[PDB]
Amino acid sequence: MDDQGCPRCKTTKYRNPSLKLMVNVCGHTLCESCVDLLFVRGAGNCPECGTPLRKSNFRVQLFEDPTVDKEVEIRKKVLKIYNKREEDFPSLREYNDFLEEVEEIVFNLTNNVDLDNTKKKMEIYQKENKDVIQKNKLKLTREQEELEE
Amino acid sequence: MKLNVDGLLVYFPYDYIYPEQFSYMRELKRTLDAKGHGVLEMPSGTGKTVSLLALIMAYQRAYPLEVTKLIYCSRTVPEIEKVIEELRKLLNFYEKQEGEKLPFLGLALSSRKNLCIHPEVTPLRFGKDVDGKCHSLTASYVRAQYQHDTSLPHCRFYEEFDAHGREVPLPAGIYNLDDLKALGRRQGWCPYFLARYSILHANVVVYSYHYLLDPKIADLVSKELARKAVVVFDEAHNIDNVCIDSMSVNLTRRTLDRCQGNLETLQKTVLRIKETDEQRLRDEYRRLVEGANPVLPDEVLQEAVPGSIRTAEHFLGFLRRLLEYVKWRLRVQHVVQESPPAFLSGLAQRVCIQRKPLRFCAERLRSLLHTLEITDLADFSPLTLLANFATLVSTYAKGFTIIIEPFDDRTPTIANPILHFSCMDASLAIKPVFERFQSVIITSGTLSPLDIYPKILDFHPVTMATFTMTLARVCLCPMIIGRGNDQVAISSKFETREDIAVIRNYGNLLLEMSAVVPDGIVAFFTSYQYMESTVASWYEQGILENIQRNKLLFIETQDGAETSVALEKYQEACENGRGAILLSVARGKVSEGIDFVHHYGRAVIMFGVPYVYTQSRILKARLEYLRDQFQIRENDFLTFDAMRHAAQCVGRAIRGKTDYGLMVFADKRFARGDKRGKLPRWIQEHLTDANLNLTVDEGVQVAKYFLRQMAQPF
Ligand code: SF4
Ligand SMILES: [Zn+2]
Ligand SMILES: [Zn+2]
């Protein structure tokens, strides 16, 4: 809430900081009062960029850094892949190789074309979906619940 | 003056020793013979080091294999400088008795900022700036560039030190910091590094606590070489505060904003490097795969693998993500938040940051930072602080706590919140010292009862010995004045602080005492805000003007520059007949730093018990844990901290040479049995019940009588 104001309507922030950033595929700061301005005309179009949005492409985020918003949001989807625990990796070198590869994919998606990344993800899907992906999904809730308690 | 101690014969330079000294040496020998860590108290500030040192010298000669080296630490470098003088005097006396040189070496370490010979760093005074310059001059790139002998300033002292200092070690001698600096100039070697090399073979090595407690720097210089060394601390009553402060790291909005800008510079630096130097510097990635210092101690420290973060572009985003989480988590406006283990979970879940990759971030930053050939680390110092905090939280939180203060005290609304990571137990950071070194002797003065320290610090002392100075003349004359001329309670209670009579009584006591007390006197309050209110009340009344007429009065402020000038003027007043009344705060840096000697602080005045603002959450977390673990009552420790601190500042008047000096406690609380018990033995035992509750005017009269007896010669 320390930002000077919205690029277009920098008046609501000065009055109150209750407004929060809205994340979009544009990786593009937006504010609730300004969101209504987008709905009236275009209905899911960035004001200056004009990037189309399927249904408003809006979710609540509170990180003033635009690039990080995409990185964090992209990372959530990436976590769904290559989520196997370290114990599944016997070799010492491969422990972080997947993590290094996983982090590499994140950077490619943020800036590089995702066509190659999407194609690669399909290759892993055909193999990992059978056992490793399903196993960790079920176990995610178990570990999370125990850790919270 | 050789002393035939029961354990062995111990040489002693000075003419005579008091009976307490006999107990001191044998008590110390008992712990040394048992090879077990212990704690002891000796009143005299001077003569305690030589007595402590004297036994070690005899013990080393008797059992050289038992003890490798002596590690005698002191609180402040200005105070360690005088210590080595005592050792130098002892060595000459011992050497004179033998008649020939002996394989004994003694030196004192310190920061490059305090001692150095390089002209470029000489004008600079800030410690952080000195390291950046020295690091750049001694940087591997400069050293590698030095081989090319290209046109660029290369710090000659280190270059020739490596070729010379490595080959030839200094046989023996005593070199203070001032003397050590001169030796480097004539020999063209670093006063700092030369001392560092000498630690390999140096019978006596002395340096401040911050060179022996914080794992970032202490561990490297304090390597396992000291398998069995007699590590000793001096006046280490506030060891926990120094020990805890080493672990505690503070992250602020101003610091965070600096990190973001510094990170941007780091990002720009990488971009320049990528276009200029890629292949050669990329080799460090292979080194990272193959496998400023981390704050993790020996066992806690881990170096398995760098983790996911393996490249500058990847690692920088890692800090970017972590910085944002702290930025947002800090900007939150709410009550003070405590979340030792949950912050790691919250950070991990919020931005998908696993702890294990985050543990190596601080080490990776240094390794990555080195690859960047940066000009200096001073600019990026805040970023490392966050990195140090970043790795510390990810490492362990069992005995820690993340404290976030969206709103700071003394301010209705401030846009500069500070994220505290204050520790709660000092045993964690001091644990390696006890294990690495066979025995540690925590020698200190004005020590509140010994039994607490094993509770505060997880250790089993061999002995708990309290020593009271024994002299032909009773130098110290302590007293407590809880009742004034109005026979009204004078306790400086938080609810009673607003009382005008209590404020008036203190002015009356000081005014009356100033009349009888000769040149040189000091008054200690509880806090700066309370001090100003008391000063203002006296200023409005004629009490302050009367005090001004009786003697000059000096007040203390937060800024050191004002304190330094005022203190120098104070010392001038005592030298002349004017005399000076230096009002100070017990917990202020001035009190601990300054030492009061003959005709200086003749009548130390303790105005009210020294207590901190209980609303301070950081203290609450520390206080709460001690109640949760180690079984210490919340009030017991709080009183203990005040009693230990009240005795700390008031015990300087009796430094040594049996210079008469009285101590007056202006609070009825001290008269309570609990307060007296926590009082140091030497101060406590001299204090009697007859004078325990002296009236303000009655106390003045006895003080006048006391001066008369001390005034006459022996
Ligand atoms: S290398 Fe030695 S002489 Fe040069 S700045 Fe550093 S400490 Fe001083
Ligand atoms: Zn807007
Ligand atoms: Zn846009």
DSSP string for B146-184? HHHT-SS---HHHHHHHHHHTT----SEEE-HHHHHHHH
Compute the distance from residue B346 Cα to the ligand 3 centre, in Å.
30
The pocket around ligand 1, CB under 6 angstroms, is made up of B 112, 116-118, 121, 134, 137-138, 155, 157-158, 190, 192-193
For residues B92 and B74, give the distance between their C-alpha atoms in angstroms, rounded to a whole number: 22
In angstroms, the Cα distances linking A125 to A94, A99, B135 are 19, 17, 50
Q: Is B373 left (phi over 0), alpha (psi -120 to 50) or beta?
A: left
Sign of CA dihedral B112, B113, B114, B117: positive
DSSP string, B653-713: GG-STT--BEEEEE-GGGGSHHHHHHS-HHHHHH--STTTT-BHHHHHHHHHHHHHHHHS-
Helices (H), B437-550: 452-456, 500-516, 528-540, 543-550
Which residues lie across from B282 on neighbouring strands?
none
Chain B residues whose beta carbon lies within 8 Å of the beta carbon of residue A107: 313-314, 317
Q: Mutate which of A62, A106, A112, A147 to test chain B, going by most B C-beta atoms within 10 A? A: A62
Q: Which residues contact A16 (CB under 8 A, 6 or more apart)?
A: none
Answer whether B329's CB lies under 8 Å from B351's CB.
no
Q: How many helices (H) and strands (E) does chain B have?
A: 29, 20
Contact A103 B307 (CB under 8 A): no
User: Tokens standing for B289?
Assistant: 């795969």
Q: Which of residues 128-147 of A touch B (CB under 8 A)?
A: 147
Residues in chain A: 149
Which residues in chain B are followed by a discontinuity, with C-to-N distance exceeding 2.5 angstroms? Answer: 291
Q: Select from B476, B524, B491 the least CA-distant residue to B681.
A: B476
Answer whether B530's CB lies under 8 Å from B587's CB.
no
Helices B191-198 and B177-187: angle between axes, nearest 10 degrees: 100
Any A CB within 8 A of B345 CB: yes
Compute the distance from residue A25 Cα to the ligand 2 centre, in Å.
17
Does the domain at B476-711 match CATH 3.40.1190.10? Answer given as no
For residue B220, the tally of other CB atoms under 10 A from its CB is 11
For residues B399 and B409, give the distance between their C-alpha atoms in angstroms, rounded to a whole number: 25
Contact A96 B310 (CB under 8 A): yes
Answer whether B229's CB lies under 8 Å from B438's CB.
yes
In angstroms, the Cα distances linking B564 to A78, A87, B363, B529, B655 are 59, 61, 39, 20, 21
Q: Select from B3, B59, B4 the least CA-distant residue to B31.
A: B59
* Most distant CA atoms of chain B, gap in Å: 84
Q: Is B544 helix (H, G, I), strand (E, B) or coil?
A: helix
Q: Which of residues 2-31 of A touch B (CB under 8 A)?
A: 2
Q: Is B449 left (phi over 0), alpha (psi -120 to 50) or beta?
A: beta
Smallest Cβ–Cβ distance between A68 and the set B289, B324, B345 belongs to: B324
Chain B residues whose beta carbon lies within 8 Å of the beta carbon of residue A72: 321, 351-352
User: Tokens standing for B377?
Assistant: 């680390």
Cα B520 from chain centroid (whole Å):
27
Q: Which residues contact B263 (CB under 8 A, 6 or more apart)?
A: B316, B319, B320, B323, B383
Answer whether B103's CB lies under 8 Å from B172's CB.
yes
Q: Which residues contact B375 (CB under 8 A, 6 or more apart)?
A: B132, B136
Q: Is B242 helix (H, G, I), strand (E, B) or coil?
A: helix
Any B CB within 8 A of A41 CB: no
Which residues lie across from B70 on neighbouring strands?
B204, B230
Q: Which residues contact B88 (CB under 8 A, 6 or more apart)?
A: B106, B174, B176
Cα B324 from chain centroid (whole Å):
33
Smallest Cβ–Cβ distance between A99 and the set B308, B313, B345 belongs to: B308
Smallest Cβ–Cβ distance between B352 and the set A76, A104, A107 belongs to: A76
Q: What is the DSSP letter of B211?
A: G
Q: Select from B208, B313, B217 the least CA-distant residue to B263.
A: B313
Answer whether B377's CB lies under 8 Å from B131's CB.
yes
Answer whether B584's CB lies under 8 Å from B556's CB.
yes
For residue A146, the tally of other CB atoms under 10 A from its CB is 8
Residue of B130, B138, B197 to test ligand 1 pocket, by largest number of atoms within 8 Å of CB = B138
For residues B376 and B133, give the distance between their C-alpha atoms in angstroms, rounded to a whole number: 6
Sign of CA dihedral B617, B623, B624, B629: positive
Side-chain half-sphere of B201: how many Cα atoms within 13 Å?
9
User: What ligand 1 atom has the least distance to the C-alpha of B120?
Assistant: 5
Contact A68 B345 (CB under 8 A): no
For residues A49 and A57, give the distance between their C-alpha atoms in angstroms, rounded to a whole number: 14
User: Tokens standing for B333?
Assistant: 């406006």
b/e per residue B263-302 (b: at least 16 CB within 10 A): beebeebbeebeeeeeeebeeeeeebeeebbbbbbeebbe
Q: Say if residue B46 carries a ligand binding annotation.
A: yes
User: What ligand 1 atom has the least distance to the C-alpha of B133?
Assistant: 5
Helices B361-371 and B312-331: angle between axes, nearest 10 degrees: 130
For A132, phi and psi rounded to 5 degrees? -70, -45
Q: Is B434 helix (H, G, I), strand (E, B) or coil?
A: helix
Residues in chain B: 714
Contact B321 A68 (CB under 8 A): yes
Cα B201 from chain centroid (whole Å):
26
Helices (H), B149-295: 156-165, 177-187, 191-198, 218-221, 239-247, 253-276, 279-290
Q: Is B485 helix (H, G, I), strand (E, B) or coil?
A: coil
Question: Which ligand is nearest the CA of B142, by number?
Answer: 1
Q: Select from B710, B713, B644 the least CA-distant residue to B683.
A: B644
Q: Say if residue B579 carries a ligand binding annotation.
A: no
Cα B13 from chain centroid (whole Å):
30
Angle among Cα B622, B628, B634 to the nearest 5 degrees reads 60
User: What ligand 1 atom has the least distance to the C-alpha of B192?
Assistant: 7
User: Tokens standing for B68?
Assistant: 């490798």
Q: Select from B578, B575, B607 the least CA-distant residue to B591.
A: B607
For residues B90 and B81, give the distance between their C-alpha atoms in angstroms, rounded to a whole number: 15
Any A CB within 8 A of B317 CB: yes
Chain A residues whose beta carbon lies within 8 Å of the beta carbon of residue B313: 107
Question: Residue B191 carries which side chain, given as an amino acid letter?
Answer: P
In this structure, which residue's CA is closest to atom 6 in ligand 1?
A: B134
In this structure, which residue's CA is closest to atom 5 in ligand 1?
A: B134
Contact B328 A63 (CB under 8 A): yes
Any B CB within 8 A of A112 CB: no
Question: Residue A62 carries which side chain, given as an amino acid letter?
Answer: L
In angstroms, the Cα distances linking A128 to A4, A75, A134, B319, B646 are 46, 18, 8, 30, 67
Order of strands, edge to edge, in the sheet holding B603-607? Answer: B479-480, B662-666, B603-607, B521-525, B580-585, B552-554
For residue B573, the tally of other CB atoms under 10 A from its CB is 20
Side-chain half-sphere of B254: how many Cα atoms within 13 Å?
5
Cα B483 from chain centroid (whole Å):
36
For residue B558, the tally of other CB atoms under 10 A from its CB is 11
Contact B351 A2 (CB under 8 A): no
Contact A96 B307 (CB under 8 A): yes
Q: What is the DSSP letter of B483?
A: B
Q: Which residues contact B173 (CB under 8 A, 6 or more apart)?
A: B105, B106
CA distance B213 to chain A (A): 33
Q: Select from B583, B569, B579, B584 the least CA-distant residue to B514.
A: B579
For residues B646 and B693, give the distance between their C-alpha atoms in angstroms, rounded to a whole number: 18
Q: Which residue is associated with the tokens 């019940």?
A: B689
CA distance B461 to chain A (A): 39
Q: Which residue is associated with the tokens 């794992």?
A: B215
For residues B128 and B379, give the distance between their C-alpha atoms in angstroms, rounded to a whole number: 9
Q: What is the DSSP letter of B215?
A: T
List the end-to-end C-alpha distance of chain B, in Å, as a whole number: 23
Order of strands, edge to edge, in the sheet holding B70-73? Answer: B173-175, B105-108, B204-206, B70-73, B230-233, B439-444, B38-41, B464-466
Q: Is B365 helix (H, G, I), strand (E, B) or coil?
A: helix
For residues B704 and B518, give the distance between their C-alpha atoms in angstroms, rounded to a whole number: 10
Contact A103 B321 (CB under 8 A): no
Answer whether B376's CB lies under 8 Å from B132's CB.
yes
Contact B331 A1 (CB under 8 A): yes
Q: Which residues contact B124 (CB under 8 A, 6 or more apart)?
A: B113, B130, B133
Which residues lie across from B250 on neighbouring strands?
B420
For residues B495 and B353, give the distance between their C-alpha atoms in angstroms, rounded to a whole number: 48
